């Protein structure tokens, strides 16, 4: 019941980035992204995060999931998901050359939905792969999209075929999670849903929330460090 504060000496760090000035100023570099004020703006107010935020993100989630205790974690592009229900398999094998996707507990698959945003997660330990949406929609498909994807990824690449026996897809029933209440929070829901399953924490938040986790969201990208 009880969130990360912050303190007044980050909320000014927040202001000084938040405010007019060249947006180019490169504001944080990291897994070959760059984030510059342009970019850290789509986190202002009631703005509609941008691709670039999104991305970093789920870097972020990525490198905390080195730490031990936490499940690995691979977190495709944001351009994986509708580079593949729009064009297929060939077009995307090629992105996972230098990486092994069974290695890991768990794929963060974030979802462009037009102009909205949802996810998909794979989790090997549960076997299971799930669809959320802080709209409560569904995608029974986009799942079946990803099983399709293990199974053709495990045949190129480990040559083997990918056992099926006992996964189950399903989409999140958009009740006990939260749901939106604003079309721009959608961004946000869906990298606070991740960070939540990344942790294996329950998804303890509402759309209270989501001025609180913008602003946090700004520091933390800043220093590259989740709180």
Not at 49 to 77: Q, T
Not at 149 to 157: F, T
Not at 203 to 210: E, K
Request: hydrophobic content about 35%; aromatic content about 12%.
């Amino acid at each position: 019941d009880e969130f990360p504060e912050i303190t007044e000496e980050m909320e000014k760090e927040i202001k000084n980035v938040f405010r007019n000035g060249n947006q180019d100023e490169v504001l944080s570099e990291a897994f070959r992204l760059t984030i510059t004020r342009k970019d850290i703006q789509t986190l202002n107010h009631l703005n509609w995060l941008n691709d670039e935020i999104i991305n970093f993100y789920m870097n972020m989630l990525m490198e905390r999931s080195k730490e031990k205790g936490l499940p690995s974690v691979h977190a495709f592009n944001t351009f994986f998901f509708t580079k593949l229900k729009t064009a297929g398999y060939q077009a995307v094998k090629r992105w996972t050359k230098k990486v092994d996707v069974f290695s890991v507990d768990i794929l963060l698959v974030p979802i462009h939905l037009g102009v909205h945003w949802c996810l998909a997660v794979v989790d090997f330990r549960k076997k299971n792969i799930t669809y959320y949406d802080s709209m409560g929609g569904i995608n029974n498909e986009a799942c079946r999209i990803l099983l399709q994807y293990l199974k053709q990824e495990s045949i190129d690449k480990k040559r083997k075929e990918f056992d099926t026996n006992g996964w189950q897809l399903f989409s999140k029933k958009s009740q006990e999670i939260p749901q939106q209440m604003n079309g721009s929070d959608c961004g946000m829901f869906a990298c606070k849903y991740a960070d939540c399953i990344t942790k294996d924490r329950p998804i303890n938040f509402t759309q209270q929330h989501m001025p609180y986790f913008r602003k946090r969201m700004v520091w933390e990208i800043l220093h590259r460090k989740l709180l």
